[PDB]
Nucleic acid binder design. Structure first.
Ligand SMILES: [Mg+2]
Ligand SMILES: [Mg+2]
Ligand SMILES: [Mg+2]
Ligand SMILES: [Mg+2]
Ligand SMILES: [Mg+2]
Ligand SMILES: [Mg+2]
Ligand SMILES: [Mg+2]
Lengths: 156, 80, 198, 83, 130, 136
RNA sequence: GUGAGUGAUGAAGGUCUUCGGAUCGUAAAACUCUGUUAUUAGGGAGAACAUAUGUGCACAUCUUGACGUACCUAAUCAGAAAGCCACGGCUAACUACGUGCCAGCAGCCGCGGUAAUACGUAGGUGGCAAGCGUUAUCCGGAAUUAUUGGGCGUAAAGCGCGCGUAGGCGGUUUUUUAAGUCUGAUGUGAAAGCCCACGGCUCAACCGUGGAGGGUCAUUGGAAACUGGAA
RNA sequence: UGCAUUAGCUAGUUGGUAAGGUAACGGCUUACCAAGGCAACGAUGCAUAGCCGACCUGAGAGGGUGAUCGGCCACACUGGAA
């Protein structure tokens, strides 16, 4: 139905009067394989259900990724904070070329053919937001003709 | 098969045919793509044809017949 | 050869993969000395080592050839993860384990050394060829039958498609490079399409 | 001085030959004036005669020489007595 | 002022964030084709042209989308004072898989990459708009 | 920076500080000059052994030497091994790579090297620090 | 290719053991299977071209082997496909024993102060392949020299602030030019090599064939929107 | 190719007319006549390096090499002159 992949976990502390106390955070990404992707962040005193605490926080907002037929339409560099990604379309039989986190938002998406490379930073909380920003900045090849007022043939 | 045909100004002249020919030219830099300009100071000989401060005239290369001058033309158009 | 115990690496990986099964008559829990314990996780290093290493013990070639057959697979046209599966079957040892000669590739991949190793001409005493469409792997002229090849020719039948052999000659010039459907099924092509690429 | 090349190209233990306008003092793989064809000296070739000699017609018509006992390939051609 | 048309064409973005429909320009002869190959390609509702004295007025009357989406969504000057570029007609680049439309001063005036193939000419490609 | 100050003073790559600085060079016998070689290993004879103690997070005490190589570039190189050798005036074959936490050694001694073939009471090291008698 | 179809927990003996049982392990025997190595064989690919006579320098027809292992065929042996390195995470590879901040590992963070999966062995496992691993030099990863493709408030980074020549860049329009610009007709950037196609080498390593394809250039044709150049 | 922590070099040195001499023009050599010529578009000085079609790396831009195999120099104990 929907697929839910953990990208990473982290053991996060806080100092109080006695010894410091721990809690686990775990951001997770939820893909739907037709090109609709959300993600969420978990924060609880346990591994195996703070995941679920994030997963229920991920479906509450999604993005509608522009599938061109097995690919992405054009070239984009979505950045957010110091981290950045370099997205680039490719041939229909290529595989996906990505780093660690930025294939967990592409194969969990429905694109399957992108050349890409991370740039700038590499902490996994800033990769994914800039990638989602990059996918929001992408447009279809027909609504550009809609706001343009042209037809599809008139652009080429 | 012909000679060279370079044109350009002069700096000055002294006694005995010291017709030095300043030539200006453009080139790209090899990497940065800027249009950098540079010159080259040439030499040719004649009787009394030129003078200081502006004697732009074509020259044409020939057999050397000097120690540095290798152009045999002082065919004049523009001057002071 | 491997010079090892292929029924001791048929449970260290997941599969015997050369027959039907040789793991139900043994402890199929784990390989050894830690079988009375759990199972761990799997990374993308688990993808590369489990899948490349679970496919190397099915075509017994050692490494430094795996890259050579990997770009030898690559230097062609099509999808790469399909084309490595297109050039997975041109080896005459594969046609000596797949045209019903013998089961295990220790004897069946020894079918160049003593048997019907002629292929449309002279003998081919190696572990493969570039056996393209339209070429017969016939029998040896002085002996069209070895010990094991004709004595166990009547033991099995109903062989694979994209091959049409006969009796009494053990020869096939059948079709072509086969389909991507008929292949070893239990592998994932994209989990090994970047594993030797990274 | 101008001659015709018979050099030792090809895989070793298989001495091939390439036919080109050479000189008497420059070595085998040395400086080459112009090409004059080749020949399959492999002794396992049916079709072999590779001399498109219209680009080699200027050699013997301007002062060439025969090359170093290659004369039976000069026998399978016929370019003489035309003048 | 250092560049005659960068100061023009970067009033467009600053008059594209805050959603105006007015922008007044120091007009030229150059820009009276620039803002019409953006009128030919939808990015402007209606430019009239310079209609006053002493090289004066020029107004543009921009175009926004249906639910107040900005339409011109990307803008770039590339061939600059201090660094020209000159792209020959063989390696003429498309803009965003050909969606955006660059523009080029060539031997037949200012044309675009729509027109860089029927003429097979090249020139100083100066912008990219998307 | 802008282009005019970038075609004027161009870019200039970073220096390459190199590991094993006390090597790559052969000081000649006749001509009496330093050279450049980029050599993997060099000979040398030994002077001291000693052992200094402190390695502040590591805290054990280990030995060293002061070999000096062909044409006298004196050095401190670390001896791998639970045992050792018994030889002053050695013919070592040194090796690069810095054993850390000792301030002042960047070099090994390959065990064997026609002076001492290592330690006899080690079996499954079998190439490191000089063993033998395996038929695996 | 130093072995092959079998072959009941399959074992005497190694290790785990709380031992009841998994493991080496279908490993092994002992059947059944094979010539690659070993005694003999005919062992004869590159291997051509003339100082002649008949016709009028051209044709046909008689003249030349150092390595002599190769290709060959045919009985048919079990002659060592072994040893390297690791096993906590980067990065697949786990248990016991002596050892107790010692002797010792170390690419990096770091492991041992008495029960170390990081020391030394043992067993097992993982990767290898006639080798494995180590030290040394270069490139990428490195956008850590950033023209594509970075920055200068507090993180490294704004001259203490003027006036200024050499150099760099420039408003608006109309004319002509043609240096930069755009374009196409040539001469050229040899061959061997890289990129694909093809023949041959038992396939492979390797060879020959026609093309990209050989950069700033060379001379004239040509277009004149922008940068020069001049009124 | 690197050094501005190398900023003033050059005196038949740069031109003219001869006289010769070389396969061949010429400050190549001498007779005078004179004043030049070079340079922040890095001259001179020291240090290191035989160049190139190529080879290794790189997605590309670039970066690093020069023994194999070919093009072209320079050199044969060290210096000169036929
Ligand atoms: Mg290991
Ligand atoms: Mg150890
Ligand atoms: Mg920075
Ligand atoms: Mg001022
Ligand atoms: Mg000024
Ligand atoms: Mg032509
Ligand atoms: Mg040598």
């Amino acid at each position: 139905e929907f697929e839910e992949r953990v990208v990473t976990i982290n053991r996060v502390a806080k100092v109080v009067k006695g010894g410091r106390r721990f809690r686990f955070t775990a951001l997770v990404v939820v893909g739907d394989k037709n090109g609709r992707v959300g993600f969420g962040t978990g924060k609880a005193q346990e591994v195996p259900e703070a995941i679920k605490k994030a997963v229920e926080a991920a479906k509450k907002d999604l993005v509608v990724v522009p599938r061109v037929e097995g690919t992405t339409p054009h070239t984009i560099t979505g950045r957010y904070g110091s981290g950045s990604v370099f997205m680039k379309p490719a041939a229909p039989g290529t595989g996906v070329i990505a780093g660690g986190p930025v294939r967990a938002v592409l194969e969990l998406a429905g694109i399957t053919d992108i050349l890409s490379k991370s740039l700038g930073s590499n902490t996994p909380i800033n990769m994914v937001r800039a990638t989602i920003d990059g996918l929001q900045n992408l447009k279809n090849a027909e609504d550009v003709a809609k706001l343009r007022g042209k037809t599809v043939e008139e652009l080429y | 098969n012909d000679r060279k045909v370079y044109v350009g100004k002069v700096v000055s002249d002294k006694m005995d045919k010291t017709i030095t020919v300043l030539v200006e030219t453009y080139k790209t830099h090899k990497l940065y793509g800027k249009r950098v300009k540079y010159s080259k100071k040439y030499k040719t000989h004649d009787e009394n044809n030129s003078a200081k401060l502006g004697d732009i005239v074509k020259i044409q290369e020939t057999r050397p017949l000097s120690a540095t001058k290798r152009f045999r033309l002082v065919e004049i158009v523009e001057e002071s | 050869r491997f010079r090892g115990s292929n029924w001791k690496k048929s449970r260290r990986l997941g599969i015997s993969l050369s027959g039907t099964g040789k793991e139900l008559e043994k402890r199929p829990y784990a390989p050894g000395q830690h079988g009375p314990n759990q199972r761990k996780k799997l990374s993308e290093y688990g993808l590369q080592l489990r899948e490349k290493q679970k496919l190397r013990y099915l075509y017994g070639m050692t490494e430094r050839q795996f890259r050579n057959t990997f770009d030898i697979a690559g230097k062609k046209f099509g999808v790469h993860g399909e084309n490595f599966m297109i050039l997975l079957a041109s080896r005459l040892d594969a046609v000596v384990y797949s045209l019903g000669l013998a089961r295990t590739r220790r004897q069946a991949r020894q079918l160049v050394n003593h048997g019907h190793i002629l292929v449309d001409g002279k003998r081919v005493d190696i572990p493969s060829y570039s056996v393209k469409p339209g070429q017969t792997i016939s029998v040896r002229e002085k002996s069209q039958k070895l010990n094991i090849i004709v004595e166990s020719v009547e033991i099995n039948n109903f062989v694979p498609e994209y091959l049409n052999f006969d009796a009494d000659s053990l020869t096939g010039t059948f079709v072509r490079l086969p389909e991507r459907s008929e292949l070893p099924a239990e592998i994932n092509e994209q989990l090994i399409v970047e594993y030797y690429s990274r | 001085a101008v001659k015709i090349r018979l050099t030792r190209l090809g895989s070793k233990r298989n001495p091939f030959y390439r036919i080109v306008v050479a000189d008497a003092r420059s070595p085998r793989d040395g400086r080459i004036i112009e090409q004059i064809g080749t020949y399959n000296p492999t002794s396992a070739n049916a079709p072999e005669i590779k001399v498109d000699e219209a680009l080699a017609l200027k050699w013997l018509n301007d002062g060439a020489k025969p090359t170093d006992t290659v004369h039976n390939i000069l026998s399978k051609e016929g370019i003489m007595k035309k003048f | 002022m250092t560049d005659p048309i960068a100061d023009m064409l970067t009033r467009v973005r600053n008059a594209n964030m805050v959603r105006h429909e007015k922008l007044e320009l120091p007009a030229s002869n150059i820009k009276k084709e620039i803002a019409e190959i953006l009128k030919s390609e939808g990015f402007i509702k209606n430019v009239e042209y310079v209609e006053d004295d002493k090289q004066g007025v020029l107004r543009l009357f921009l175009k926004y989308g249906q639910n107040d989406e900005r339409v011109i969504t990307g803008l770039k000057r590339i061939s600059k004072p201090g660094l020209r570029v000159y792209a020959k007609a063989s390696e003429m680049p498309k803009v965003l898989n050909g969606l955006g439309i660059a523009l080029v001063s060539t031997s037949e005036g200012v044309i675009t990459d729509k027109e860089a193939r029927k003429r097979n000419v090249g020139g100083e490609i100066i912008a990219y708009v998307w | 920076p802008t282009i005019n100050q970038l075609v004027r003073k161009p870019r200039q790559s970073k220096i390459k500080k190199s590991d094993s600085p006390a090597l790559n060079k052969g000081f000649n016998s006749k001509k009496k000059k330093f050279t450049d070689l980029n050599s993997p290993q060099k000979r040398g004879v030994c002077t001291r052994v000693g052992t200094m103690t402190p390695k502040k997070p590591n805290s054990a005490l280990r030995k060293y030497a002061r070999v000096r190589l062909s044409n006298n570039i004196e050095i401190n190189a670390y001896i791998p091994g639970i045992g050792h050798n018994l030889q002053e005036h050695s013919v070592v074959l040194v090796r690069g790579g810095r054993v850390k936490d000792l301030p002042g050694v960047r070099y090994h001694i390959v065990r064997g090297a026609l002076d001492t073939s290592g330690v006899d009471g080690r079996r499954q090291g079998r190439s490191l620090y000089g063993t033998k008698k395996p038929k695996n």
